[PDB]
Structure 1
């Protein structure tokens, strides 16, 4: 369930940036705020989090990179 749900979520957020398969920092943030209010801890952390998370993509988090985030969320 969770993988599919999170893929759906991910895709729906991504689509807002036109690119149906990728989350820019703001999209990643926005999604994390809405879906996971506390995971971000404090806004600034997005820098570190995104830097770590988006290892390959750098600019935009693909579902590949996002699954690294999922491995943290655990659900």
Structure 2
């Protein structure tokens, strides 16, 4: 579920940033939060750690990196 939902949205958002594999924090947050309304699986661990990464200032996030990070920090 979450992989597919995240990815499906990610492709569309990432298209704005040209490379469908690459998204950034700004969109990332929206994309994560979406799993809230969708599956009640957005605005928790995922966004919390991504806010930390935002404060560190990662900014740019590839799908793969994103995906592995969110599930690894959650589990």
TM-score, with structure 2 as normaliser: 0.53
Query: Stretches of 4+ moved more than 4 A in 1?
Result: 37-48, 51-57, 72-75
Q: Give 5+ residue unaligned stretches, structure 1.
A: none
Which structure ranks higher in relative contact order (CA pairs < 8 Å, sequence separation ≥ 6)?
2
Cα distance, 1:54–1:7 mapped onto 2, change above 3 Å? farther
Q: Distance in 1 between matches of 2:50 and 2:72?
A: 13
Query: Aligned-pair RMSD on alpha carbons?
Result: 4.9
Q: Distance in 1 between matches of 2:2 and 2:46?
A: 23
For these two proteins, the number of residue pairs brought into alignment is 75
Q: Give 5+ residue unaligned stretches, structure 2.
A: none
CA contact (8 A) 1:7 1:63 kept: yes
Give the stretch that moved more between structures: 24-33 or 6-15: 6-15
CA contact (8 A) 2:33 2:43 kept: no
